[PDB]
Amino acid sequence: QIGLAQTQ
């Protein structure tokens, strides 16, 4: 289980 969230 991997959750990856990115914002710029």
* Helix (H), strand (E), coil (C) string for the chain: CCCCCCCC
Instruction: Give the separation between CA 3 and CA 1, rounded to whole angstroms.
Output: 7
Number of H helices, E strands in the chain: 0, 0
Tokens 């969230």, residue located? 5
Resolution of this model in Å is: 1.0
Instruction: Give the separation between CA 2 and CA 6, rounded to whole angstroms.
Output: 13
| Amino acid at position 8, single letter | Q
Instruction: Give the separation between CA 8 and CA 6, rounded to whole angstroms.
Output: 7
| Amino acid at position 6, single letter | Q
Instruction: Give the separation between CA 8 and CA 1, rounded to whole angstroms.
Output: 24
What's the Rg (C-alpha) of the chain? Answer: 8
Elucidation technique: electron diffraction
